Design a protein around this ligand. Sequence first.
Ligand code: CW5
Ligand code: CW5
Ligand code: MG
Ligand code: MG
Lengths: 365, 355
Amino acid sequence: DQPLAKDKVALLIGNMNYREHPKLKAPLVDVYELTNLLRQLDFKVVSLLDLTEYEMRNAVDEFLLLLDKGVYGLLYYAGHGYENFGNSFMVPVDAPNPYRSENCLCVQNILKLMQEKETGLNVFLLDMCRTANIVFGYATCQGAEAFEIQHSGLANGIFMKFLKDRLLEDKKITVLLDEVAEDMGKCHLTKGKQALEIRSSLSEKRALTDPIQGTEYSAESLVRNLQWAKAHELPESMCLKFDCGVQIQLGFAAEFSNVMIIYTSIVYKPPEIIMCDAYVTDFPLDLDIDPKDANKGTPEETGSYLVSKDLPKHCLYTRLSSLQKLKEHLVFTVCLSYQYSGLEDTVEDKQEVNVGKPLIAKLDM
Amino acid sequence: QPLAKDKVALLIGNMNYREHPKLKAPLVDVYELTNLLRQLDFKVVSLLDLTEYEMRNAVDEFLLLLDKGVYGLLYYAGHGYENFGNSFMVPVDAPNPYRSENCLCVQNILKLMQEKETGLNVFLLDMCRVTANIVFGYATCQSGLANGIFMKFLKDRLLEDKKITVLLDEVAEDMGKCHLTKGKQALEIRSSLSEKRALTDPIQGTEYSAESLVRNLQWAKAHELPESMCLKFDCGVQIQLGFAAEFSNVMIIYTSIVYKPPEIIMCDAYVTDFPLDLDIDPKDANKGTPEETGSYLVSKDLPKHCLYTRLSSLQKLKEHLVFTVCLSYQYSGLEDTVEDKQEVNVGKPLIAKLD
Ligand SMILES: CO[C@@H](C)c1c(NC(=O)Nc2cnc(C(=O)N3CCCC3)c(Cl)c2)cnc2cc(Cl)nn12
Ligand SMILES: CO[C@@H](C)c1c(NC(=O)Nc2cnc(C(=O)N3CCCC3)c(Cl)c2)cnc2cc(Cl)nn12
Ligand SMILES: [Mg+2]
Ligand SMILES: [Mg+2]
């Protein structure tokens, strides 16, 4: 009979904004598209961008605790990576130049910890820039040379380009990764720029497409679902009524588990008010929001290019990345600049908004 | 469509450990894998019970054969050691406890294989406890004449015209049903294979290059058996001496009385006084069946009604293989048993020719 998953859980980490090393662009697109693909396959996904050492360790340790008997897990990392005496390491964004293994996450130790699990399937995919049923995919590419033409910017990396066209196939994961490796070989344009090593201990016909076992509302199942729901909570849409009668709608969208977009629009303006501007300000110092990047006419201007399609139009947009850096409640100000018909003077009002700890910030861990 | 420049293989089976538990499966597995690879047009070197120095010489010489486009296969069956993520092949002279220095480093062999422009390089470990296209199979599951778990499943799939990675994946799947290895991580496959390579791929239209000649010569040089001898004794008795290869370091010697004059009422021929280096126990020599010498695998191809002697550890031969063919006979009527002997020199047979 057909193989089944107890559950399907995934942790996707994309590092781009390196403090002491070259900046990367592909992790943003790859993490976003892989998230949507795994969602189609009924995975609960945590997608995190630009994590420090402490943040990566917390994320990986908590992902591993979800790996109960029969659970299908997937760990994906895209960013800088290095090899030191056969051992590979994932480089966090706060890593000093040059790398030191103690500042990095040891790949082999994660594989060792995965081995101790009774998972139905455990897929660990490394997309680095240079019985547990574990399938390890180690992809390496050279970093872009200084005088090389930067292409699309919204382009996928070589590994995701090939992986995304095969990942939805109802096929044994080992067989599937083998065909991705072959497709990479068949492309002479990528033949010298991208490598893929697959390591497998898979002894059964497991696939990412395998169905999740019939609804068992166990405490173990509820723990996994709660922990993932707890981190994917968006504040509800707000209607702020100003004393002058002007009504502002405040909306919240998620781009990643640590990335939220805030948007505002004037939903009601009394006939007596002629000019009317709403804008957000005074964000927690921890989020490091540059006001120059806030209140934009388009999401693309905020550095938000993935959710841009799903966002309501004719709003002012603010991108709140690095949500895991929020220690307190997300408190900010909604400012209003208005003017009555005829009158020269501009009247000003403001309302403080507290939206709690949204998305991954809710994790007091 | 894909082709091999050549097909070369080194198979090592360690069983008779001096300071460690003895193994049984390497004998059967090495023998059967040799025959299977031969059907696939591989030139094979099959070696049993090698010391550290012997294993290093064998592996270093196998690696030198790995020219551009060559298909290589390295197989090791015996004891293994894991020390801080690194695996090691344990030679038969390993002390107890053993150290990494006395053992062969797996990762260093993979590193040396990476430096090659081989069309395919298959390194299979079956242990107890231009790009290179390396496929690494690491098995950890190692009565009497039975195969090991890994070879049991590998031998029923190995002749299939199928990509080696796909083929090893199916062996892993099949192995994940067998009662002894049920739900155990008993096979890890590591691959960098980016093309559709198989062990069944044909060898490129046989060229006559010096490179090709080097590979063929070196393998030919190590598989030379002495020719069958007819020894005529002064009394008229004729003994036929035959030689068979079981492994590259294992030869079977067999004798039969081919002619007996009518005046001789009864006679016995037996072999004796073998070089001290071969460490032949006379108690194990001159048996009525090959199975009694510890040689069941070549038994079917051997002539029957002979006396059999198994000469294993041929790589320990420093000199020429010199021994005695003894004759005990008795004339009609007479009570006395007459004795004669002839010394035989058969050179350095099989892997002993290397030195
Ligand atoms: C959300 O569900 C959890 C259980 C979960 C993971 N856990 C995390 O990522 N955990 C944390 C924990 N802490 C931090 C952190 O440093 N801070 C700073 C203060 C705010 C958090 C960060 Cl980035 C991440 C990982 N993978 C999955 C996949 C599924 Cl499905 N769930 N899941
Ligand atoms: C390149 O040479 C050929 C024969 C060859 C290999 N070479 C060896 O096995 N070489 C040695 C060399 N020396 C020793 C040894 O220690 N002694 C002690 C004195 C007598 C030998 C031993 Cl056991 C083995 C290895 N694999 C292959 C595969 C094919 Cl195809 N050919 N091939
Ligand atoms: Mg007998
Ligand atoms: Mg028999």
